[model samples]
Target chain A: APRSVDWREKGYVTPVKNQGQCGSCWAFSATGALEGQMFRKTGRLISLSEQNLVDCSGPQGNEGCNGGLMDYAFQYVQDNGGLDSEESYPYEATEESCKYNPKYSVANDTGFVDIPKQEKALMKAVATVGPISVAIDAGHESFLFYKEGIYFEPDCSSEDMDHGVLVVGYGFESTESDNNKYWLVKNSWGEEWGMGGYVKMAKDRRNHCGIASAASYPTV
Target chain B: APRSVDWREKGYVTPVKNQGQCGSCWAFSATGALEGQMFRKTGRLISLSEQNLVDCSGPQGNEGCNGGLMDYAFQYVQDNGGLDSEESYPYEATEESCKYNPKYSVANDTGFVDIPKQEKALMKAVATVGPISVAIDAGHESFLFYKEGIYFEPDCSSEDMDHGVLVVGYGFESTESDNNKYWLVKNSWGEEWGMGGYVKMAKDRRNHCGIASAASYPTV
Candidate 1:
């Protein structure tokens, strides 16, 4: 390929932010996907609040400072009209009282479309649609220190999803001896990790880390 | 106010070509500046010969396939009656016998002029005189992986000008956090490297890195 894709290159991606020690990986993944969708449709990158989801989504199965699913968060966003701005709600990484303010809401979702539990289907969605929020086994300590190069989690189980990540884009690379077909994954980690808060996972490796297991994205 | 310039985008720059580690940075830089001049005059991206300079120009001040200088190379090209086309003279990146065929000289120049040893003058030369030759401390490691960022080597010095590059154009990038004035530099490395063998150096910082210290260009 002449070049590779990073959604941030198109100004569709919100700057990667640290989720810290909070178990709110799903919130970050969902925000990345939603931000992408919103930016593509409106040409505006509206930064949404993870704190709003962390605090207010308790009714729809998301626990503050705990864990959640992307579909649940999307449902909460669609039902509640919109998600607030990061400046208004601000992520605290801990449980807090829900201060759901409508005045600060920057983006809204009409509904969400969940891809089929197949890699081919997921690839199609990424190509035609915008970014998609996906689940992964991010519990591996290796992911924390990932700097550069394609990362393959050989021991990851598809059934046990422990972390959530965003599949921003995909492409192929040719090394001297091997051809690498991979997905461009955006993690909640900071820029110092992986390829600037992004990682390349070997695509079609039997859906490595269950990336295609429960992936979905919102409609703006 | 900020400004922007792109020779490639403006149709004044030829496509990047590979020199294959020939120590032919001087040749590429010369050909690029000449190509820009020719293109601006005739609206054609006429490919010039780096191989001709590598094989010839021995007595005129270039050590073919080993090392050379842009000013001397352009002077030699002018006196030797013009370099051959890349298709006819083609590059081998090694010291070989001079095969200066006269019929294949696609482009020629009478001479080149030196840019004033001032930052504003160099900028004016690029804006009005097409691409210009510039020497820099290319030994720095960061110059290798340069993609889209404006490189300002704090440790770079004007005391040592090691590599010759073509300053094809200039531009400015400003965000809420930073504002940068940069010169779009074209390197001899292949397309896979550094923004397709090109770089953007921070401009107007008292000629940081000797970019303006040793600058000149061909007159076609």
Candidate 2:
């Protein structure tokens, strides 16, 4: 069957970064959620350039490579057109830019739709529609992963959601282990990254990082 | 960088079956590659229900959801020796399973390894390492899923590659999308499925079935 989720109540937010060798996760999470909102709104699956936001979004309260808020990244996208594609902008992970392309950005007042704390709306927005970026506390071991699963490292408590990803779908499996349900998430580290550019997260455990908001480009 | 692929010489394989929209892509591809080898070696990722392989592999196949392969599936240790879990073993497109005592099936060589005429040893090794699976042509509109170099689709090329999956790794994506990059593969449809879910094919072309492979076990 197709996967399902209660996007609103799932409360799966995460910190900005989970030190991927260096610490680019901050930018990844920031742009990830925004990209999701964009896709959800326009029905366009565009990979917003994290490098653009990382470098041009201006300095924030946290260290660039270390940490930041996804909300701030959304703000940056709001101020400027959303980030560009990696091809146009390229991700240096550190904070650098070539010639900024105004044509590639999309800056508009896309109001956030506050679902009644119900994940169903979020699920509807994503499954039947576009992408939804989210922040998650991907534990240390999760960074080196090569497959898919809602990984809960032994050291990680429910509060350790610090990574970001796009929830693509959810479903059930009939294989080994405890047949616990899960969600299918997409990552940007590259196709070689995490289960072929995707990761699985627990479906039952929602409130990991208080991820309850859905940001989108203002509907024109 | 955007993922590159060699698409010409390898041509494109048909889409495989998904078995009721199940998303056990890892297992599908593992068996897909094997099937492909069966076609080339024997011929096709078809006939095999990489899903069945997945169901029996236990938790190694990411609870049979999210995604996983056949490589390490053999190593999965069910509570009672080994057993397939598709509904007890429900086939949802996500990774979730009910807790069950470990069970092991009878240990017998599933079948023979088909080596294609022009297949490379490395690719064959990659498939043997696990059951390769992929998203074949389901005739869905996945054309618009191009952003930041990632292509998401809903179908494959021919009926032979439908729903079922195989293993074909040790290949390469192209930088220009015109070369041939065949991967060695494995399958889980006993010895009768797609090259036993193994095959050598190209990478990155529309409808060519995005064959993704992996090798992992279910962690209890």
Candidate 3:
């Protein structure tokens, strides 16, 4: 059966603005996922600045350039408060100064949930709650093409969580790609890419990018 | 002055595959880039399996789930007669079997040219050539949430290429962000992601995702 979710009905987040070739996908996914969670929790669509997380979250296991885990990244923000608006600290693919002041509006545990352990619960929670941040290995051309409908890569191993994306909802592929249940995802790339900056990943496939294990979000 | 080149003239290729959440981006970039070069040379677009490159190319100095260098990956393939097509071998996120018959088509020269020494020349070559496969650090959200225009993360500082992508062409951006010369890049996250499976990167920025100095094909 094709599992599904009402992303819009639950107020899942819209796609975000990203700077390509910067290698900051982790930060973007982390922030965007949290932003969706926050929106669902607070009913406010605040464009949480990824730049803030990228610049402010000093070396937590992963450096600005190399890579880091979202779990640790979330902790970095929790201890420091929350991130700012994109306008206050615009994203410059590269790491820059943390110009904005801290705003701890939500007294939440800004920690990354254990993706492997929490992903199922997280997905279920999101259906009734809001958006969730999941990681997938985006190491293929199909993921980068940004076209419409369901795109199934025969090879799933290359998909790494190197790039972070937001899980808005889940849907079923009625005509395209032969009825594959898909996880409706919003990407940071512009509208010119994919189905309006969205991607549909396999629903039945577990541990997609170890996503089943690496799912996490801030607790406000 | 802005630099530009015609990728199609160089015979760059466009093949699609799914990297379903493993951190073998270096393998994909190296193999994919080489596959394009090979296709341009042979006039046949073949889907090279990243799994073969990831599994066969042993002892890479970087983390498989985090980041790596394409130069090392290329060297590995050059010495190992390259890899097989997705049709014959297939791909699974984890290391699997090599089903295709071994066909040593070329000599092994698995080595990378220094970025400082060859980035510009390589870009020019790719512009004159076809699509060039390369790796960049895509750990930030800006890179993930990229929408339009060329993205250059000024905050990133990783020395390794964590994500694999293709360089299609270059252009100049005169919009909301700083006006600068940019490289048109293709990603593997499916066409629905960034700019129709493409992301714009800075032409001049070096040390930022190594965009200025990543490795490419035709090093000979």
Candidate 4:
């Protein structure tokens, strides 16, 4: 693996999209992982449809606009032929009928593999296989209104993963006291919430916020 | 319903695409129905994917690259949320593993409704719903070389429908001896196979070639 990798700078990441009031962060994280793998395969960066999962993956154990899991969403795509383009199937942020037209799928995956419960393994997957999907304990109020700088919550729990996001890369940042290693993570709360809908988390620590507790990536 | 409706002229039909040597004509027929319905709903005529159906709907009673049914393909999409775009999930005309992404679905269907096996019902559905999916007996050598004019084979059987196609509209055409009423249809053999990848089958002739034997449409 390289010493550092930023998929966004390398053109493997898509623009930040807002998930609105729906609890569809899991769908966004899943599509973010797929978008990176698809770019690696076809060199095309198409925004996949998150609304499709919100409306259609209920039978696969997804709770539609209420809540869902990334792996179950991937299973829905594997069973279906492929997904439609975001442009073709625009998101509504609310549950609607399944209007997926199989003829317009842009990218797809075989299945997903979970990383070992270690920070090193999660970093390796991001450096080698592209961006990865991760679950974290985002129940903190400070985590919601994050503005800038490295985000860390000492009281965060590894066993409670209430939020999903994508990790694009990792590197070091300068500080007056000491150098800080951080993870470049993308969020679904819209650009108005953080640093252009992204946040840098304290890395090289013991999985802060449980970022490494439930990590995985899709196989293209 | 009006006196007649030509969805192709009205901008509801997509261009003709070849299925190559694969026996996936049913996939094309399924997309034709959804594409027409999507256009009626959004006024956009986007070509859907047939390859997605060829590769991903096997477990739904469809044999990839060999043969399948339109209703089964629709069922798969209904279960999976939606299909991918043709540009995103381009057709290879052969069977491959499932690579569907759920983020890009364009159009989808809640379910499909089959028309009664009657010429009156078939024409009524096309006039009201848009384009329609139908099965026919395309086993004759002459049927393969169709160029222009209304196509009719006296010996064509209505009981054995071996080919699936779309009925875009119904109308009357000119002839030296008598007036001819025909069903304008879209075929999947390619643009070089017929009159620009289309044919006019003889209509109101006891369902010649089983044009109304197994007809259906998708709901947007």
Candidate 5:
């Protein structure tokens, strides 16, 4: 297995998008993983409509603009036939009527697989599965204004996963004589936060923020 | 005990303020408690400086703009002679240098006390002791967009207290056949959130959101 991998360099990742005041991070994470799967299958990268998931995934137990679980979103996509493109549905960052038009559907996912609750399993999934959707304890202030660093929160609770993100890669950096491992994460809070909407979270720290506890990847 | 109480109704609570993007809710919570204590003793309501605590409480283990505990802030107030009035220090919602001039000091606390981790104890504190500082699991999306009604989050973790708030009172509302009990919580997110920077949190639900876990009150 490769020691490190970044899907962005492989042309599988898209530009960061903002969720505004909405708590639709689960939609963004699900769409990010699906987009990666679509790129791996068709060799074409497309920004899937997070709004589509935000609006239509409620019946599948995903609350629109009020937070949700990623696997439930994948179930919605599978049952709804496919998801629309961002250009077709767009994002408003608020809960609104589901105006899903199947004619605008751009991508589909057959299913998703959850990585075992271990950092090694998560690293293996990220290295081989393009990008993965994960949940973490993002309630701390350090995670909110994360600028740059191997973001570590010793105070973070492992079972209290409050925010969802996409894990695109993993690697290690040399600091003095020590090699500090980190996970490349993508957030939906906009590019103005944390290394242009990304955070290098500390890796191999006993799932500090529950990064590996609820990790999954969509399969096309 | 009275069926309900509101410290605001008795002129002990100040106007709702905004914390902006800073995670200094701890400072605001601390000041609110001290302000209530000052009003209880002097019969004059004074707006205490959250900025003073945000800037100067770090020496007492309170991280400005990042996060802090209410008890730590109380300890800082007790040791620093007193806290300045908001009219002099003012809130910028950002961590700046400690320019807390003692000339503007208006409120002082001898010490603080913690209520037992129980809903009944928290209710008693709010009813008899005025506004009390508390830590809770305010990381849920249901909490962020709480508009009206008794805010209830069955999914919130009790052990994961991430936000500081002030419990000004407790009451029960008759809803046809049911009496919905709630705690009047004051948040520092401005008047646009909840009901004018306040939330009616569901009470007697096994300390839902950890409302009684780390509750404290300043003694003047």
Candidate 6:
């Protein structure tokens, strides 16, 4: 069944967060999807701790507060038993002491799966599964002030992705040429940044900044 | 007769801006004070360009976007004749070409004055002058995520001023033990960063974080 679904409309997307000056997008993106996944399964909205993953996920080659892969972060939470709530662990936005309290820990994923390179699979995964954690070249010039549009950049390379975000939903916007679908992506850079803490990306065969290159989600 | 004055209450301070990963606190701080002084003189609120100072203040010893000095920026503006409005000139976060125009110039200052090395003098200057420009040690651990508090670190430096900001107002918040005077300072990092792009620094003779050091204001 190919039906349009907005996870944000379904009350799944949590409030956007500010990552401060640190390069810890991996943890924020990972927690974003896992938070939605946990909410979908348990019917209870819980804010997972990004700082917990930042400090604890380094054993799997993830840099504390610098940068890391979101897939490894899912493994980090699964291997560490579970993760704490944001209210319990909290986010310092910098590399600090690792204080993981399993008592107030809210949710943890069983595992994560990498989406295929095909565009149709990515769309299907986002609809059926929870919010998909994906990587993109978020530091691009045109993408920074992206207010409203399809935001298509054919020149942007998927192999040079530098930032991580969570794709919450998808919809089609009419174009003169063909059907122009857009991905509703949530950012960690607070609500004031873009469209209230979100950046809409053009979803088509271009893959737009390789968003389809590193797509994954939790198996709660 | 000593009285307190707030540039914000008088409708002088402009909307806070985000430096966007650049160490250009110097531009935001310098512009805050300049815009305040300009509004107080001309009765017109104008958003001066930070990108102008970031790109063109190099000859005056400003490193353009990487870092800058409030005092040196004032000198750069003075020598460059005038500054452009934010809407016209705009901010790029990173270093770019200096395309300043006289037609777009919205504010011009006669000169700037460096305040004396006395806390009382700093207070008197703020009362008479419209929001004085100041520098401080922002690298302090306590200042990283200063939400709401009389931010105090006795061990912070006075000589090593690494960051710049604008002192808009001052007030006395009496704690149980002692008199806690604090400065209402404005930062360039987005409104989501601190107490809405503002922080309360402990106002004392010890000069926490060198806030009183290198204090100056533009003469409009």
Superposed model 5: Cα runs more than 4 Å off: A1-24, A32-107, A111-137, A141-161, A166-219, B94-97
TM-score of 4: 0.49
Predicted structure with the largest TM-score when compared to the true one: 5
lDDT of model 1 at position A1: 23
For model 3 chain B, give the 10-residue run with minimal summed lDDT: B104-113
Q: What is the TM-score of chain A in candidate 4?
A: 0.96
Model with the higher DockQ, candidate 1 or 2: 2
Chain B structural similarity (TM-score) per candidate: 0.94, 0.35, 0.78, 0.96, 0.97, 0.95
lDDT per residue for candidate 4 within B92-207, as digits (tens), equals: 87789988887767878888999999989998998888899999887543465467888876558899586789999988775535648889899887787678999999888889
**Model 3: residue A97 alpha-carbon error in angstroms:** 2.7
DockQ score, prediction 5:
0.14
TM-score per candidate:
0.50, 0.40, 0.54, 0.49, 0.68, 0.55
Name model 6 segments beyond 4 Å from true: A1-3, A175-179, B1-220
lDDT of 5 at B210: 90
Taking the tens digit of each residue's C-alpha lDDT, what string does model 3 give over A4-83? 77565555565546555565566777776677677767787776666666676775554664465666668877787666
Show model 2 residue runs off by greater than 4 Å. Answer: A1-22, A30-45, A59-63, A97-99, A106-129, A174-179, A206-220, B1-220
Candidate 2, A122: how far from true, in Å?
Answer: 5.1
Candidate 1's residue-wise lDDT over B62-133, tens digit each? 886556899888888889987898899888866799999999888888888998888898988887788898
lDDT of 2 by residue, A109-211 (tens): 3333333333555555555533465555543323333366564433333453455456656666667467466666666556665666666656555533333
Which predicted model would earn the best lDDT?
5
DockQ of 1: 0.01
Q: Let me know the TM-score candidate 5 reaches against the reference structure.
A: 0.68
Clashes of 1: 0
Error of 2 at A179 (Å): 4.8
Model 5, span A1-220: residue lDDT tens: 5877889999889989887657889999999999899999999899999999888888889888668999999999999999999999999877789888999998998878988999999988988888999999887656765778788775777895978999999888866344388899998877877899899988888887999999998778
C-alpha positional error of residue B62 in candidate 4 after TM-score superposition, expressed in Å: 64
Which numbered prediction scores highest in DockQ against the true structure? 5
lDDT, candidate 6, B1-220, per-residue tens? 1445567988999988877646678888889999998888889988889999998899989987557788888898889899999999888877887899889998887778999977788888888887989998775324654677777654467886867889999887756357478888998767876798889888874777888778999887
Give the per-residue Cα lDDT of candidate 2 at A75: 62
Candidate numbers, best TM-score first, in rank order: 5, 6, 3, 1, 4, 2
